[PDB]
Amino acid sequence: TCPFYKKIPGTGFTVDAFQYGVVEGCTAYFLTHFHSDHYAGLSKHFTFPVYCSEITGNLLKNKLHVQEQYIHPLPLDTECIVNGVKVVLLDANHCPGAVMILFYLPNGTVILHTGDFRADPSMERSLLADQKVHMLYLDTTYCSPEYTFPSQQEVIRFAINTAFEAVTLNPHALVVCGTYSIGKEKVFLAIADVLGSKVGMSQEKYKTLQCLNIPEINSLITTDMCSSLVHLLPMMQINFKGLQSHLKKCGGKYNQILAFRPTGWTHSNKFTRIADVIPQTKGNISIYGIPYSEHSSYLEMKRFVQWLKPQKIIPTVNVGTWKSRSTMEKYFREWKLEAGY
Numbered sequence: 394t395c396p397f398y399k400k401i402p403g404t405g406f407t408v409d410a411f412q413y414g415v416v417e418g419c420t421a422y423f424l425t426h427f428h429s430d431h432y433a434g435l436s437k438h439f440t441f442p443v444y445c446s447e448i449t450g451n452l453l454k455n456k457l458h459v460q461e462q463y464i465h466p467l468p469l470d471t472e473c474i475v476n477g478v479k480v481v482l483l484d485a486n487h488c489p490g491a492v493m494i495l496f497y498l499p500n501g502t503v504i505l506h507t508g509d510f511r512a513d514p515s516m517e518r519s520l521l522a523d524q525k526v527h528m529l530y531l532d533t534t535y536c537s538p539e540y541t542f543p544s545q546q547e548v549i550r551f552a553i554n555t556a557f558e559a560v561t562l563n564p565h566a567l568v569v570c571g572t573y574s575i576g577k578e579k580v581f582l583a584i585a586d587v588l589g590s591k592v593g594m595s596q597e598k599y600k601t602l603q604c605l606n607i608p609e610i611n612s613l614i615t616t617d618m619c620s621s622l623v624h625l626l627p628m629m630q631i632n633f634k635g636l637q638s639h640l641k642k643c644g645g646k647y648n649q650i651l652a653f654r655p656t657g658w659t660h661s662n663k664f665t666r667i668a669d670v671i672p673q674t675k676g677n678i679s680i681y682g683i684p685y686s687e688h689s690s691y692l693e694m695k696r697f698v699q700w701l702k703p704q705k706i707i708p709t710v711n712v713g714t715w716k717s718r719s720t721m722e723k724y725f726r727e728w729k730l731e732a733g734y
């Protein structure tokens with residue numbers, strides 16, 4: 394059944410709850426972002442109102458084929474009324490079109506649901522500064538102090554410098570970037586930009602990117618692989634066999650591959666700096682795992698919550714085991730005692 398952490402009390406609303414059939418009592422289904430665990434269950438046969446950002450609405454229409462009449466896009470940073478309840482959508486700093494949702498309940502309670510987010514100090518000057526939030530439905534993906542990672546800026550700097558040096562030493566080296574969802578487009582765009590190339594990709598991935606309202610996108614991507622020296626591939630193909638394979642396909646236009654795998658966290662975060670990363674190498678193929686995260690570090694999350702001072706926290710991630718639940722509740726109490734709310 395639909396878990397309690399997907400239901401908004403005192404409304405008929407649910408968040409990211411599309412794979413339970415009809416939820417008894419649900420009058421409006423909100424969708425925070427277009428990632429498959431969140432949208433799972435949506436299709437052309439859905440006949441209930443879906444509320445989401447413009448970008449998530451373009452993807453529901455074009456990639457899932459949900460019918461236009463059931464898609465209700467809302468602008469960001471704007472007080473809107475949905476079935477008689479005031480709501481605001483805020484940028485989540487996750488993937489394109491990802492939002493947080495503020496619900497103002499008729500009883501006076503204010504609820505923030507973060508969806509998936511990477512907390513940032515800039516959020517402390519959004520419409521959240523304006524009033525008190527009583528309950529927080531929190532993205533707890535990396536709620537443990539071992540999870541450190543560098544800034545997005547630091548990681549992109551590294552990738553840019555690595556690629557530019559490699560291709561300048563060898564003009565017949567190909568750059569390959571893995572992907573399996575929207576998100577992390579800065580990685581392959583920033584590399585393409587320093588190399589004076591457009592990024593080349595499959596027809597399905599191009600279609601996906603043309604939904605995202607990226608400015609000048611037509612100048613930055615292409616379906617013609619041959620003209621491009623930054624290729625996107627399915628993340629599954631980012632390994633030596635898949636890359637050798639792909640290398641044959643280019644018809645001797647390249648003799649070397651430099652590949653990036655943008656991971657979340659991986660245990661080498663606990664021992665190694667971004668300046669000191671090294672790749673896995675087999676012949677003329679090298680693979681860098683780079684820790685580009687679109688989720689809050691432990692410290693970023695802690696700062697956000699200690700700023701917001703919620704009365705109650707409901708985790709939405711890692712909720713499946715008693716041990717995870719208990720560990721999370723311990724950190725929340727530490728935070729509250731240190732900060733005095």
Ligand code: NI
Nearest residue numbers: 426428487509
């Ligand atoms: Ni996500």
